[PDB]
Amino acid sequence: NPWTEYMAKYDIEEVHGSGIRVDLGEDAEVAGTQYRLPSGKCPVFGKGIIIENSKTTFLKPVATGNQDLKDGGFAFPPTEPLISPMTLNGMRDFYKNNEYVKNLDELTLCSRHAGNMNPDKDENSNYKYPAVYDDKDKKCHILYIAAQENNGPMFCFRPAKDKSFQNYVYLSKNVVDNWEKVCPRKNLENAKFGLWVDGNCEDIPHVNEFSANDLFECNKLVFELSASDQPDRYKSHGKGYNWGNYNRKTHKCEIFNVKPTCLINDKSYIATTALSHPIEVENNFP
Amino acid sequence: KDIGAGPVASCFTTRMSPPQQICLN
């Protein structure tokens, strides 16, 4: 297969290895009690948490002391020294003496910064808060609340890719420092995912067709159906409907749950994944 | 706990050197 190297970033079980819609792929202990926490190796572009219909609430600080949970968001409340939110330049200055951290790309730096804050009195606790990086403001928001969904017939909330979240990047403690090379980001224009069979790229044999007005709506649908760790039995390990072939002519999102192993050059298609940014395209067919 | 409910924390100790105590407020 001449596509092996190129296609490695689309093997979501391997490269990401946890849920996408809801990432709770590991467990960590804080003072004798076990907690679930995000563990995906790739950044999730465009993911936010919608709280009771609100889109501008989840990055607000969490409720402080004698405040109700619904009165706040999910982010770290004000600290001394102020470590959240923190601009990219702020983080680079905060870590100026640490040569192993100060020059990390902004997404890895935000993950490492959130992961630096141990809530336990024990130095060996593996509990590492996730974070959201906002590309518009270049601000890392550490998330005090690691939960991503609480739905069903208060504090009701769900993960989503919404136009208001298009510049947000959801980051677990495990985001890899070379995500730019090994993780998806851009949608592939003029390409559709396929399966390599006896020297040819064959179509995915079975797909689930959802109608979609544009690429954003297709990416949103793939995200909705993607790997989810929401209730070891609950862990996806990255298995799910993580890929879609968007046909821009018929306005169809062809969603599937097997990893793709090649690309087909087809001008009617754009290849997307639940991790991918909901807008950005790359038009360089390899 | 099954949906990601987390610990109640007021102060944090940095993991990377130099270790420092960062508290809420």
Author numbering:
A (entry chain A): 108 to 260, 273 to 350, 388 to 442
B (entry chain B): 2027 to 2051
Quote the study that presented this structure, word for word.
From the 67-residue construct, PfRON2-5, that we previously showed to have affinity for PfAMA1, and guided by the TgAMA1-TgRON2sp structure, we synthesized two analogous PfRON2 peptides: PfRON2sp1 (residues 2021–2059; numbering from the initiation methionine in PF14_0495), and PfRON2sp2 (residues 2027–2055). Significantly, there is no polymorphism in this sequence among P. falciparum isolates. Both constructs incorporate a disulfide-bound β-hairpin loop proposed to be critical in complex formation while PfRON2sp2 is truncated at both the N- and C-termini. PfRON2sp1 and PfRON2sp2 were co-crystallized with the first two ectoplasmic domains (DI, DII) of recombinant PfAMA1 3D7 or CAMP strains, respectively. The affinity of PfAMA1 from 3D7 for PfRON2sp1 is 25-fold higher than for PfRON2sp2, highlighting a moderate, yet influential, role for the N- and C-terminal tails. The two co-structures overlay with a root mean square deviation (rmsd) of 0.81 Å in 304 Cα positions, and the two peptides alone overlay with a rmsd of 0.34 Å over the complete length of the modeled PfRON2sp2 (25 Cα). These data confirm that the reduced affinity of PfRON2sp2 is due to the truncated N- and C-termini. Our study allows a detailed structural assessment of polymorphism at residue 225 since complexes with PfAMA1 from the 3D7 (Ile225) and CAMP (Asn225) strains were determined. The 3D7 and CAMP orthologs both maintain two hydrogen bonds between the main chain of residue 225 and PfRON2 Thr2039. However, Ile225 presents a deep pocket to Arg2041 with apolar contacts formed between the aliphatic regions of these two side chains, while Asn225 presents a shallower pocket to Arg2041 with the Asn225 amide group stacking against the guanidyl group. Nonetheless, our binding studies by SPR show no significant difference in the affinity of these two PfAMA1 homologs for PfRON2sp2.
The formation of a moving junction (MJ) between the membranes of the parasite and its host cell is essential for invasion. Two important components of the MJ are Apical Membrane Antigen 1 (AMA1) on the parasite surface and the Plasmodium rhoptry neck (RON) protein complex that is translocated to the erythrocyte membrane during invasion. The extra-cellular region of RON2, a component of this complex, interacts with AMA1, providing a bridge between the parasite and its host cell that is crucial for successful invasion. Here, we report the crystal structure of the complex formed between PfAMA1 and peptide segments of PfRON2, which, together with our previous structural results on the TgAMA1-TgRON2 co-structure, highlights a conserved, crucial interaction in apicomplexan host cell invasion.
